[PDB]
């Protein structure tokens, strides 16, 4: 079963397929990575098979990167304008981080304001406490709750949500801590997260 490592959804259709990197194995919605609606590759014209190879941006550059915004090494990355790397999901959820091209989600331009938040909050969900003050934490978005976590640490716990397009919320990406989360949403998100972990390995 294919799960997108950015949004943890499992729907895969001809318009938005969940694809897989043929080197590191990560799986992602075309539309969650800016690789949607692109013509078949030139290597693909050869084969008569129904599929063509695909590689994420980090593998295209021969790196197994770390993220400027969190301590996790898993998931899928985009290059920054300074030659560093960030998770797609970190860039979506961290305030003040935007994509320079929304259609292809590239590149990511991090600012002095982003860097001044490094280590500024302690991640309350880090399993390795040695990294709880690396990177940049987001907070719970319920009321004035001041609970902080890395984006990818919240993702694992099933805490990242995305508003539907019809809801017309300007920033549709939000997170709640466990105290304020939707219990059903957390259930299926952790389930898809765990299936994604078993899938890659």
């Amino acid at each position: 079963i294919l799960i997108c490592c950015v949004c943890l959804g499992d729907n895969s259709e001809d318009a938005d397929e969940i694809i897989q990197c043929d080197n590191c194995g990560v799986t992602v919605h075309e539309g969650c990575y800016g690789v949607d609606g692109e013509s078949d590759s030139i290597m693909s014209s050869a084969s008569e098979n129904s599929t063509e190879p695909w590689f994420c941006d980090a593998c295209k550059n021969g790196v197994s990167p770390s993220c400027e915004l969190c301590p996790s090494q898993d998931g899928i990355f985009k290059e920054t304008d300074a030659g560093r790397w960030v998770h797609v999901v970190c860039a979506l959820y961290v305030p003040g981080v935007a994509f320079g091209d929304i259609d292809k989600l590239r590149p990511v331009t991090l600012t002095e304001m982003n860097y001044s938040k490094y280590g500024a909050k302690e991640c309350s969900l880090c399993e390795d406490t040695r990294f709880a003050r690396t990177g940049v934490c987001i907070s719970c978005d319920a009321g004035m709750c001041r609970s902080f976590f890395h984006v990818t640490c919240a993702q694992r716990e099933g805490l990242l949500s995305e508003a539907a397009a019809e809801e017309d919320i300007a920033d549709p990406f939000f997170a709640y801590c466990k105290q304020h989360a939707d219990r059903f949403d957390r259930k299926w998100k952790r389930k898809n997260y765990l299936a994604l972990q078993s899938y890659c390995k």
């Binding site: 001809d14 397929e17 694809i19 897989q20 043929d22 075309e30 013509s39 078949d40 693909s44 129904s50 599929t51 063509e52 190879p53 695909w54």
Partner: peptide
């Protein structure tokens, strides 16, 4: 891998 657009209905 990725499914070619030619093979997408």
């Amino acid at each position: 891998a990725r499914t070619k657009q030619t093979a997408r209905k």
